[PDB]
């Protein structure tokens, strides 16, 4: 039972705080873990909100150049706009070819939160809202380089190059945005009950729990 691009899973954190990554609405871009909401044997009531789709690494170079422009030249801006469209089209095409391919440890993936249709994203230039020395994690619709994560093995049963097995505990390590995804114990003031997910050197493990195979 291996994990594939296109599979839909939930991510269960095991750390100082245990729980599935979830969100706080369609507008609020904060990611959290609610320990009391549920666990592996007793999953939370709103599980629709804990679902992520495993996606390939999107190209963002042309998009970034365009977003960046800024610029006064309309001719240039149109060339960049076109290039960004060709890039988005290439992601669409290539990502379709990758559907159903097995994910190997060391691969770069993106995590699409299905309910909000946004990617889990690390912001290398922003501190987390609560945990001081950590970097901020947010939900971003288009995503960016901060949405790129290496999926690495938490334990040595499997190594880089091996297929990721369902139920495996992994490290979600940003490619260049910062440190591993962390399930902190920093409780949100406004909410219960919810603890901040951020990016910082940590020992959190993330268990990949399969919900639906890609072909569905």
Distance (Å, whole) CA 20 – CA 115: 14
Q: Which residues, in sequence order, are bridge partners of residue 151?
A: 172
b/e burial code for range 69-81 (CB count within 10 A of at least 16 → b): eeeeeeeeeeebe
- ω into 193 cis (within 30 of 0): yes
Contact 100, 167 (CB under 8 A): no
Neighbouring residues of 175: CB distance < 8 A, sequence distance ≥ 6:
108, 145, 148, 149, 150
Domain 1-216 fold: Trefoil (Acidic Fibroblast Growth Factor, subunit A) (2.80.10)
What length is written for the chain? 216
Method: X-ray
Pairing of strands 195-199, 31-33: antiparallel
Q: What is the resolution of this structure in A?
A: 1.8
Distance (Å, whole) CA 25 – CA 45: 15
Q: Smallest Cα–Cα separation from 53: which of 12, 89, 5, 101?
A: 5
Calculate the alpha carbon distances from 84 to 69, 100, 113 in Å: 11, 26, 23
Backbone angles phi, psi at 28, to 5 degrees: -70, 120
Calculate the alpha carbon distances from 138 to 15, 67, 163, 197 in Å: 20, 19, 28, 9
Three-state DSSP string of the chain = CECECCCEEEEEEECCCCEEEEECCCCCCEEEECHHHCCCCCCCCCHHHHCEEEECCCCCHHHHHHHHCCCCCHHHHHHHHHHHHHHHHHHHHHHHHCCCCECECCCEEEEEECCCCEEEEEEEEEECCCCCCCEEEEEECCCCHHHCEEEEECCCCCCCCCECECCCEEEEEECCCCCCEEEEEEECCCCCCCEEEEECCCCCEEEEEEEECCCC
Neighbouring residues of 5: CB distance < 8 A, sequence distance ≥ 6:
54, 55, 56, 95, 98, 99, 100, 101, 103, 109, 214
Q: Which residues, in sequence order, are bridge partners of residue 14?
A: 205
Distance (Å, whole) CA 186 – CA 17: 9
Residue 88: Cβ-neighbour burial (10 angstroms; 0-12, 13-18, 19+): middle
Within 10 angstroms of residue 67's Cβ, the number of other Cβ atoms is 13
Distance (Å, whole) CA 36 – CA 175: 31
Contact 117, 108 (CB under 8 A): no
Q: Smallest Cα–Cα separation from 114: which of 211, 33, 44, 200?
A: 211
How many CA atoms lie less than 13 Å away from 52 in the CB half-sphere?
27
Rounded to the nearest 10 degrees, how much is the dihedral formed by the CA atoms of 111, 115, 118, 122?
-60
């Amino acid at each position: 039972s291996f994990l594939h691009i296109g599979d839909i899973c939930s991510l269960y954190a095991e750390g100082s705080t245990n729980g599935f990554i979830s969100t706080l609405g369609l507008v609020d871009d904060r990611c959290v873990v609610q320990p009391e909401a549920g666990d592996l044997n007793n999953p939370p009531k709103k599980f629709r909100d804990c679902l992520f789709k495993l996606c390939p690494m999107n190209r963002y170079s042309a998009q970034k150049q365009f977003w960046k422009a800024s610029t006064t030249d309309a001719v240039l801006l149109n060339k960049l706009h076109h290039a960004a469209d060709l890039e988005k089209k290439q992601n669409e095409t290539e990502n379709r070819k990758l559907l159903g391919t097995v994910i190997q440890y060391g691969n770069v993936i993106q995590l699409l939160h299905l309910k909000s249709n946004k990617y889990l994203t690390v912001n290398k230039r922003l501190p987390a809202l609560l945990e001081k020395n950590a970097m901020r994690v947010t939900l971003d619709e288009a995503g960016n380089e901060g949405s790129w994560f290496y999926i690495q093995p938490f334990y040595k049963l499997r190594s880089i190059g091996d297929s990721v097995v369902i139920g495996d505990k992994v490290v979600l390590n940003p490619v260049n945005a910062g440190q591993p995804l962390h399930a902190s114990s920093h409780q949100l003031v406004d909410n219960p009950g919810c603890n901040e997910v951020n990016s910082v050197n940590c020992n959190t493990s993330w268990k990949i729990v399969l919900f639906l195979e890609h072909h569905h």
